[PDB]
Amino acid sequence: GGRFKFPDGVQNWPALSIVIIIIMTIGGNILVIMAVSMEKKLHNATNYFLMSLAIADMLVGLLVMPLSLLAILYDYVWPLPRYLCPVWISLDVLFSTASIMHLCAISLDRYVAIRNPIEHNSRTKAIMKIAIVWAISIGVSVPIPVIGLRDEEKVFVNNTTCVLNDPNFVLIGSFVAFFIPLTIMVITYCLTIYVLRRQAADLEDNWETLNDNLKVIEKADNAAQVKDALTKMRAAALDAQKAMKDFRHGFDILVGQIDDALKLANEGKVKEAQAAAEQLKTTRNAYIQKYLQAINNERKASKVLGIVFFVFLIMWCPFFITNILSVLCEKSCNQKLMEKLLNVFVWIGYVNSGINPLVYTLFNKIYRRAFSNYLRCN
């Protein structure tokens, strides 16, 4: 009666339990799609892009993970019809790349928004980005149907197991789908953290000059000395202002005290100006806390960026690196262990798709309360 498998030919039940992570991925992104849909605040362009990413990652857990689970259930013997594997593999390359490409764009956008925060029809650009991202991924995926259709031996080999059999594609696909985006995310990340640290140093330097000039005002006795030190603060305040409205307004109201004290410093006596430097001391200490919460925001952003980039490396690097070694190293490297590692590094890349939502909820207050409400509402 032929050679059957399903629904009881399962050879590995311990692997079945791994469904747990699958259930987390599908729902994890659904909550994001809910947040961007229900919440009025999350109708921002960048959030629509996170939704697109969520669509990519959700489809990974929806269409790629379950079929890889069946593959493990039957000890890597394809139980489904033959035509359904090249379909599976192509989807694997598609959504996985879409996930990567999306992540790369997020890095780029975050750099621009950090460099020149003056940015705010605004949706047409986001639509343009989503389209381009999905267009590139499709390009990376179309070789699968092409190669598979023009030769059956290249998708599954022993009339049993289904695995890529074209080393040229593996090299190219890996190089263009991961290593080029990786290079962009490396340089991008480095520039972003550089800009961030430079902005922090600027605020700290402006605050130091505001203190040092006050000390030397209380110190010396020359009316022109008070004039010089008292004028250098006016610039240090105007420069720190352009670097939360109560803070810039604090620099604006203390500037007025620098005007009064500077008027009484040239035509008046040094003692009265030094007495005005006291009122300046108090107006500075009034906002010393708002200065600390500003620099704290700087260090917070630095940590979040370092996390997301680190996670991306830890997740996708093992697969693609070993994938490269498995093709271009056909002798020196151990091949049996290579397959043993790749089998796990594949699902590590999968887990990244489920980590992305869990990442953008741990740090955003709106997503935290949005998730905490979607889980308890139903």
Ligand X SMILES: CN1C[C@H](C(=O)N[C@]2(C)O[C@@]3(O)[C@@H]4CCCN4C(=O)[C@H](Cc4ccccc4)N3C2=O)C=C2c3cccc4[nH]cc(c34)C[C@H]21
Query: Residues 165, 86: contact at Cβ < 8 Å?
Result: no
Stretch 160-219 residues interacting with ligand X (CB under 6 A): 163-164, 167, 170, 173-174, 177
CB of 164 to ligand X, least distance (A): 3
User: Among residues 323 and 361, whose Cβ is nearest to ligand X?
Assistant: 323
CB of 88 to ligand X, least distance (A): 8
Query: What percentage of the chain's residues is helix, strand, coil (to nearest 5)?
Result: 80, 0, 20
User: Among residues 56 and 237, whose Cβ is nearest to ligand X?
Assistant: 56
User: Among residues 183 and 211, whose Cβ is nearest to ligand X?
Assistant: 183
CB of 336 to ligand X, least distance (A): 10
Query: Residues 192, 107: contact at Cβ < 8 Å?
Result: yes
CB of 308 to ligand X, least distance (A): 19
**Nearby residues of 84 by Cβ (< 8 Å), 6 or more positions away:** 67
Question: How many residues form the binding site for ligand X (CB under 6 A)?
Answer: 20
Q: Give me 15's structure tokens.
A: 């692997």
Give the alpha-carbon dihedral of 337, 338, 339, 342, to 10 degrees: 120
Q: Give me 253's structure tokens.
A: 């109201």
Q: What long-range pairs does 296-300 form, CB within 8 A, spacing at least 24?
A: 298/196, 298/199, 298/200, 298/203, 299/200
Stretch 81-100 residues interacting with ligand X (CB under 6 A): 92-93, 96-97
Query: Residues 244, 211: contact at Cβ < 8 Å?
Result: no
CB of 74 to ligand X, least distance (A): 14
Stretch 95-134 residues interacting with ligand X (CB under 6 A): 96-97
Instruction: List alpha helices for 150-179, DSSP H.
Output: 167-174
Stretch 303-332 residues interacting with ligand X (CB under 6 A): 323, 326-327
User: Among residues 177 and 301, whose Cβ is nearest to ligand X?
Assistant: 177
User: Among residues 24 and 191, whose Cβ is nearest to ligand X?
Assistant: 24
CB of 310 to ligand X, least distance (A): 20
Question: Which residues in this chain contact ligand X in the complex, by CB under 6 A?
Answer: 92-93, 96-97, 140, 163-164, 167, 170, 173-174, 177, 323, 326-327, 339, 342-343, 346, 349
